[PDB]
RNA sequence: GUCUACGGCCAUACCACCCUGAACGCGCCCGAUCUCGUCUGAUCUCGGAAGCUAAGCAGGGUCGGGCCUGGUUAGUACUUGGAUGGGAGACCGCCUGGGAAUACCGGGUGCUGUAGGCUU
RNA sequence: CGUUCAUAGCGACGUCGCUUUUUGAUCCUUCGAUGUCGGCUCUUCCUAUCAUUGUGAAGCAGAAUUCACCAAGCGUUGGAU
RNA sequence: GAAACCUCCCGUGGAGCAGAAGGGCAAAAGCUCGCUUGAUCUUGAUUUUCAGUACGAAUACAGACCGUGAAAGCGGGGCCU
RNA sequence: UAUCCGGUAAAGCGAAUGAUUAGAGGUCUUGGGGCCGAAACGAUCUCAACCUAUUCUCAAACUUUAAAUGGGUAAGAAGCCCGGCUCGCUGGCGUGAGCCGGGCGUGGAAUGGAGUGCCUAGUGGGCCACUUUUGGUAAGCAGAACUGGCGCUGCGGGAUGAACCGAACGCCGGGUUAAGGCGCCCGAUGCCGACGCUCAUCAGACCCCAGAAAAGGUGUUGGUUGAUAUAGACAGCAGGACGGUGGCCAUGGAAGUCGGAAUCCGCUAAGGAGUGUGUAACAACUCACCUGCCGAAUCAACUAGCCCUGAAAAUGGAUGGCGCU
RNA sequence: CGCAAUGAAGGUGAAGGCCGGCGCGCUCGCCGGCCGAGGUGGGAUCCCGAGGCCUCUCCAGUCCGCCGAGGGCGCACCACC
């Protein structure tokens, strides 16, 4: 008899993508290979991200991709995003970029290409740079989802600012006993 | 039909399954609950740090030049 | 079921020791705590304004705030399964500087002395501590006189 | 009189099982890597270490190993910890690969680091996977009582070597 | 303590030196035990009682087995005890007749178990002294002090009862 | 050597009685016009400077009490961990480490910071 | 106490036990039910022996007797309320 | 007169401090005077019960307007529970 | 390794609080009762409370002391050390805080990959053991602490068994163990095992556990302490047991003898102002000191081992059984 | 439904910086230019890279790597301002 807890012996990370789609799965076959045979950890990070959920690979807006490449020095590079590239209607002038993405929305595609931008697929990125050399690996804001505003220290727990799940906002949906001082108390 | 009234029997065990973790220390803790009169004044001090910038930058350049003269004298 | 009262069971804790009642002698008040001073809390009966709760007596923690005549002081209090770092506003009279940290600072100062010197020399010196090692080989001279014999003594009933 | 040095190093065998064992003991027993019954480890002695053995006394038999004991344990049951896989020290290419950054490049070097308790003891001793020894041939005296008082537990100093031979 | 057959051990030790007491006095004992390991322990037990001195506070200097200097002489040993009864603690003076001190103390430990159901850990041996023909107070010893000693081995009951487990011959016990 | 003013730690500094105190201080001391306050110039407040160390104060003394600190008490009482140890129980012994408290007997009996005197 | 005599028979103040034919404690079992008092009838066991056999004791002269031992073989009844 | 009032001495609190008890308290936290309304107006922070929600109770501040004191200060109820 | 916290065990009561024994000392106070006093701190006692040293014995809701086990912190890069700026705070000047800019690396042992977020079921009757512990005569009773069990869990041992001891299970071969054993049931002593103890007309025979105490016993075995005796004892039989003396108190009779204060001398070889028997009371009898014989050890009081008495239940019966000396 | 909140409501409704000038730069008011979602610490990852390390010789010497001390841009995310 041995004393170990077998409690957290199984690591819960993903191995493959849970999706069954065939084009992504080909990318996975390609980046598994590169991951293992190259020294590049870029390939490993990319590989890891191909297995993740929709939630877990959030969309990267065009404006966010602009400003991250506006940063000093990462000039004449390629931005990479395992998610999708979306438009920003609240940005106007779009520099000529180099981009990798699993998806780019039709607007975002036009705007970039009109600028003299190049768009790449991930099979194309590999041939272009199999060890991820000269890349900017970005990500969309993970904690964008409105979901997260309900997460945390519960509402009605002093110093929480945590959206309650409520049928409809309005004068008479919550905001009585436990928010006003006038009505019982407040947190 | 009287019960058991209270105990703490299996509780230490229960607590230590998942550790009894020490409270996660960060650097840069908040200034929540600090004497208001202080906080006003450090806020104002922070407000005007950009005033007295041009002086400060020059002073560091003069320091950097003095360091470069010292390292040249050493070598 | 016991009473939840604040001062329950502090008959002995908050009670000035034997022949140390009366005026809180003045050093106590007139010594300075900054931010981040390590400070051990020890409630006192004479001063009842700003007393800590019986749970924080004995406990050490760091100063975070300093008001006119008190000191905010983060201390860790365990609660069944979870340790809660929490911030309490003790009046000075219930608080000393904890020396626990100073012996450390003494050692780091001594290290900085022993790092500056022994750099130009070249001989590197033991900066880390080391636990008490087994007590080495050595001779014991039974100088002239032989060993003293110890017979165990015969029992007898005294009372 | 010549009072020789108090010993540096001691072998520590876990001599009772893994049921109904106090939490303070249990923790120390898994700070000596003595998880299974009849696992053993070398252990350098000092005020800290010795007292940890004091807190687990009726759970272990231990004492001061011979030279031969260190050889027999290392050669017959010498297993590296090599990428967290218990692997038998079949060649020095294994020892070197791991401990060669300390000047330890062979089984022999290892034995000298363990036995003299060198600078690099911690790293050579941790490299060794804890020694899975068999049951004590010829049996024990009494599991539950101390050596001094007839049993097997506790410090038996010189006599840990007899036990080693009947288990290794 | 337990047993087997004991060995006299000499164990000398000292409360280890300090600033205040630079060269402390050595204390020696006669500690009968199956092995040095428990000898040293037994040394510490006796010293703790007598002197303010513990295993932490001291160092054993010289533990060493002590050999009977006249093994092949038959001797008479006086041995003074200090046992624990179920009731109060006692003193005795036992006498044994043996070739050795060790043998004579071993002999004692067995007797005490027999005659008083006294277990090792209860018994304190204080002095063991070899003794003349005279100064022997116990008649169980005294009967063997005689030049022309003469006795038979009368009803010589057999062993080897299972060499022939079965046999024709009823045995013999006269010799 | 020592004092005064403001002190820190608060009896090794307290209490009792006894002796001795140069100089400068500190006092007691002599007054109530004014300030101030009392039933009362006792205290308090104020203006003094003839006396005196009697007292306070200091320094010392006592096979002094007290306090402070060692020994002893004692590896005793207690105690962490151990056993298919004992014992009808009550309790006890061992192993493993930790370890006190009176009575009794010694020694000690304020140290010192800042500012200013005096012994020129 | 027993004239006298602690102990033939007793036995205060104290103390140590056994017993489960008293009553309590307790609530483990049974609430998809174990028929709830007494008497009648019948068998068997126990002994902590009333009698009967064999015996030790006496404050046993005899008679009557209580005290104790072996001992449960055999008995231990008829009625009024 | 054992007890009225006055006076001298000793007095570590053996009294008193609304109430239970515990703590605390002596040129006070007691008693006696003088002046008073901090038991007033207003944000948050924190403690205690705690789930670390409420209530009550409390702690440190901060901003007003006052009180009192030569002043330093103390005071937003009751020495603390 | 440093450093704080503590008021439980113990200890203490010639330290506080409360309890409490005894005598010394004290007209402290004063008394109430006396005896000798008219009365008198006069003399003599006394008991009350108080006090001066001592003294006996105590405390969950007392304590001057004060453990063990125990709870905080700390043991470095978020750290040190320089340079300069910001402030409506603080202020003789200075603080203190916040900012920039440089300069310096393992800072006790042992071990281990860490962090972090979402959904979330069952559960919310518990029980058992060590130790601590409250109520109760106690309980296989009721109630807490601490750890570990059982519940959820098989396996070896404990005959049998929730929970004891050992040990924790994928399916199998070889080896070795634990706790337990080894007459036969039943794997192993079919050892030329070692040394003792003990005979029971109720023997005894292994944690939890299934059963006995006080008190006894020249039963036997050990101790401890004291004797004794050649100035030849010790028992075993044989010879005397007196006088001063109806001693004194007690008369109801105690000249040794219901009881009690006494309690010595003579003769002495030596006999107690008497161990008992018994007497109304004597008497009479009986119980040292010494010899005669015999011929070496003798005898007392404790103590602890086994054994025995103490020891009584109902179907016939259980060291598990058979049995065992 | 989402892309805007917050207030009981009448309603209001997410930009800041810098520079130069003009009003007294008054840490306030008005006029021209430039940048345009702030900063600290940690951050997978990219980027630069002294310097090795050899090549069958003594040096020259572009090409290719391997490592890389040191230094940078810093996603997401977290904590703080
Ligand atoms: Mg599992
Ligand atoms: Mg319940
Ligand atoms: Mg055990
Ligand atoms: Mg006057
Ligand atoms: Mg004077
Ligand atoms: Mg004088
Ligand atoms: Mg003195
Ligand atoms: Mg009578
Ligand atoms: Mg019943
Ligand atoms: Mg039926
Ligand atoms: Mg009978
Ligand atoms: Mg008041
Ligand atoms: Mg205010
Ligand atoms: Mg308590
Ligand atoms: Mg106690
Ligand atoms: Mg339920
Ligand atoms: Mg129940
Ligand atoms: Mg269940
Ligand atoms: Mg177990």
UniProtKB/Swiss-Prot annotation, chain B:
Q: Per the record's keyword annotation, is Ribonucleoprotein included, yes or no?
A: yes
Q: Which residues carry this modification: N6-methyllysine?
A: 4
User: Where in this protein does the record say N6-acetyllysine is found?
Assistant: 32
One of the protein's GO biological processes: cytoplasmic translation
* Principal place of residence: cytoplasm
Query: Where in the cell?
Result: Cytoplasm
Location of the region described as Disordered in the Swiss-Prot/TrEMBL record: 1-32
Keywords, comma-separated and alphabetical = Acetylation, Cytoplasm, Methylation, Phosphoprotein, Repeat, Ribonucleoprotein, Ribosomal protein
Give Gene Ontology CC terms.
Answer: cytosolic large ribosomal subunit
Question: Residue positions of the PTM Phosphoserine?
Answer: 30
MF annotations from Gene Ontology: structural constituent of ribosome
Name the family the entry cites.
Belongs to the eukaryotic ribosomal protein eL29 family.
Its assembly, as annotated, is: Component of the large ribosomal subunit.
Role noted for this protein = Component of the large ribosomal subunit. The ribosome is a large ribonucleoprotein complex responsible for the synthesis of proteins in the cell.
- Name of the protein in its database record: Large ribosomal subunit protein eL29
What organism is the protein native to? Oryctolagus cuniculus (Rabbit)
| Portion of the full-length sequence here | 2 to 76 of 245
Curated annotation (Swiss-Prot), chain C:
Q: Name one GO biological process term.
A: translation
The alphabetical list of record keywords is: Cytoplasm, Endoplasmic reticulum, Ribonucleoprotein, Ribosomal protein
List, in alphabetical order, the Gene Ontology terms for molecular function in this entry: structural constituent of ribosome
Q: Where is the composition biased (Basic and acidic residues)?
A: 111-122, 135-144
Q: Name the principal localization, coarsely classed.
A: cytoplasm
Under the cellular component aspect of Gene Ontology, which terms does the record hold? cytosol; endoplasmic reticulum; ribonucleoprotein complex; ribosome
Q: Which InterPro entries match?
A: Ribosomal_eL21, Ribosomal_eL21_CS, Ribosomal_eL21_sf, Translation_prot_SH3-like_sf
Where does this one sit in the cell? Cytoplasm, Cytosol; Cytoplasm; Endoplasmic reticulum
| Region named Disordered | 111-144
Which Pfam families does this chain map to? Ribosomal_L21e (PF01157)
Family affiliation: Belongs to the eukaryotic ribosomal protein eL21 family.
The entry's function note states:
Component of the large ribosomal subunit. The ribosome is a large ribonucleoprotein complex responsible for the synthesis of proteins in the cell.
How does this chain assemble? Answer: Component of the large ribosomal subunit.
Return the protein name.
Answer: Large ribosomal subunit protein eL21
Q: Give the gene symbol.
A: RPL21
Swiss-Prot record, chain D:
| Keyword tags | Acetylation, Cytoplasm, Phosphoprotein, Repeat, Ribonucleoprotein, Ribosomal protein, RNA-binding
Indicate the principal place this protein occupies in or around the cell: cytoplasm
Q: Which residues form a coiled coil?
A: none
User: Where on the chain is Phosphotyrosine found, per UniProt?
Assistant: 59
Which of the residues bear the PTM N6-acetyllysine? 44
Q: Could you name the domain of life of the organism this protein comes from?
A: Eukaryota
GO terms assigned for molecular function: RNA binding; structural constituent of ribosome
BP GO annotations: maturation of LSU-rRNA from tricistronic rRNA transcript (SSU-rRNA, 5.8S rRNA, LSU-rRNA)
Gene Ontology CC: one annotated term: cytosolic large ribosomal subunit
Subcellular location per UniProt equals: Cytoplasm
- Please give the subunit comment from the record: Component of the large ribosomal subunit. Homodimer. Interacts with DHX33.
Give the family, as the similarity comment puts it: Belongs to the universal ribosomal protein uL30 family.
Purpose: Component of the large ribosomal subunit. The ribosome is a large ribonucleoprotein complex responsible for the synthesis of proteins in the cell. Binds to G-rich structures in 28S rRNA and in mRNAs. Plays a regulatory role in the translation apparatus; inhibits cell-free translation of mRNAs.
Protein name (record): Large ribosomal subunit protein uL30
Name the source organism: Oryctolagus cuniculus
Covered part of the full sequence, start to end and full length, is 41 to 208 of 208
């Amino acid at each position: 008899g041995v004393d170990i807890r077998h409690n957290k012996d199984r690591k819960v990370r993903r191995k493959e993508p849970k999706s069954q789609d065939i084009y992504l799965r080909l990318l996975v076959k390609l980046y598994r290979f590169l991951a293992r045979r190259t020294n590049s950890t870029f390939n490993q990070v990319v590989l890891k991200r191909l297995f993740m959920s929709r939630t877990n690979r959030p969309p990267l807006s065009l404006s966010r991709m602009i400003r991250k490449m506006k940063l000093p020095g990462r000039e004449g590079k390629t931005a990479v995003v395992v998610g999708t590239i979306t438009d920003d209607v609240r940005v106007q002038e779009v520099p000529k970029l180099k981009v990798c993405a699993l998806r780019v929305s039709s607007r975002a595609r036009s705007r970039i290409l009109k600028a003299g931008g190049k768009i790449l697929t991930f099979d194309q990125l590999a041939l272009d740079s199999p060890k991820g050399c000269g890349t900017v690996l970005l990500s969309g804001p993970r904690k964008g989802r409105e979901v997260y505003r309900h997460f945390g220290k519960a509402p009605g727990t002093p110093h929480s600012h945590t959206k309650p799940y409520v049928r409809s906002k309005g004068r008479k949906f919550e905001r009585a006993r436990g928010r006003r001082a006038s009505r019982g108390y407040k947190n | 039909a009287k019960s058991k009234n209270h105990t703490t029997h299996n509780q230490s065990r229960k607590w230590h399954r998942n550790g009894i973790k020490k409270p996660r220390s960060q650097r840069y803790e908040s200034l929540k609950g600090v004497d208001p009169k202080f906080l006003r004044n450090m806020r104002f001090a922070k407000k005007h740090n950009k005033k007295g910038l041009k002086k400060m930058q020059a002073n560091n350049a003069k320091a950097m030049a003095a360091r470069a003269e010292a390292i040249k004298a050493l070598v | 079921t016991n009473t939840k009262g604040k001062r329950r069971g502090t008959r002995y804790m908050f009670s000035r020791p034997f022949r140390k009642h009366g005026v809180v002698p003045l050093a106590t008040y007139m010594r300075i705590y900054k931010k981040g001073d390590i400070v051990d809390i020890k409630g006192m009966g004479t001063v009842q304004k700003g007393m800590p709760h019986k749970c924080y007596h004995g406990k050490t923690g760091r100063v975070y705030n300093v008001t006119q005549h008190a000191v905010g002081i983060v201390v860790n209090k365990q609660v069944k399964g979870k340790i809660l770092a929490k911030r309490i506003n003790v009046r000075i009279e219930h608080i000393k500087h904890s020396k626990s940290r100073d012996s450390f600072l003494k050692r780091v100062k001594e290290n900085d002395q022993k790092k500056k010197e022994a750099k130009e020399k070249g001989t590197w010196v033991q900066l880390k501590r080391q636990p008490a090692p087994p007590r080495e080989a050595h001779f014991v001279r039974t100088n002239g006189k032989e060993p003293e014999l110890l017979e165990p003594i015969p029992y007898e009933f005294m009372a | 009189f010549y009072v020789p040095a108090e010993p540096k190093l001691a072998f520590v065998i876990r001599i009772r099982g893994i049921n109904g064992v106090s939490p303070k003991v249990r923790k120390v027993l898994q700070l000596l890597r003595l998880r299974q019954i009849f696992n053993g480890t070398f252990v350098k002695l000092n005020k800290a270490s010795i007292n940890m053995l004091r807190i687990v006394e009726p759970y272990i038999a231990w004492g001061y190993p011979n030279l031969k004991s260190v050889n027999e344990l290392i050669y017959k049951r010498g297993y590296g910890k090599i990428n967290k896989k218990r692997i038998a020290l079949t060649d020095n290419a294994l020892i070197a690969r791991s401990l060669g950054k300390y000047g330890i490049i062979c089984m022999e070097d290892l034995i000298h680091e363990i036995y003299t308790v060198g600078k690099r003891f911690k790293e050579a001793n941790n490299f060794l996977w804890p020694f899975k020894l068999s049951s004590p041939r010829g049996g024990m005296k009494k599991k539950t009582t101390h050596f001094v008082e007839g049993e097997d537990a506790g410090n038996r100093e010189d006599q840990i070597n007899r036990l080693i031979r009947r288990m290794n | 303590k337990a047993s087997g057959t004991l060995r006299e051990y000499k164990v000398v030790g000292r409360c280890l030196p300090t600033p205040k007491c630079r060269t402390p006095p050595l204390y020696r004992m006669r500690i009968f035990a199956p092995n040095h390991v428990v000898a040293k322990s037994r040394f510490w037990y006796f010293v703790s009682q007598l002197k303010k001195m513990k295993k932490s506070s001291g160092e054993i200097v010289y533990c060493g087995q002590v050999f009977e200097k006249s093994p092949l002489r038959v001797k008479n040993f006086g041995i003074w005890l200090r046992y624990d009864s179920r009731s109060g603690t006692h003193n005795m003076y036992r006498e044994y007749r043996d070739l050795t001190t060790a043998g004579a103390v071993t002999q004692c430990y067995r007797d005490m178990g027999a005659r008083h159901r006294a277990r090792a850990h209860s018994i304190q041996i204080m002095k063991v002294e070899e003794i003349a023909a005279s100064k022997c107070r116990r008649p169980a010893v005294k009967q063997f002090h005689d030049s022309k000693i003469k006795f038979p081995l009368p009803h010589r009951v057999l062993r080897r009862q299972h060499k022939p487990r079965f046999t024709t011959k009823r045995p013999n016990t006269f010799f």
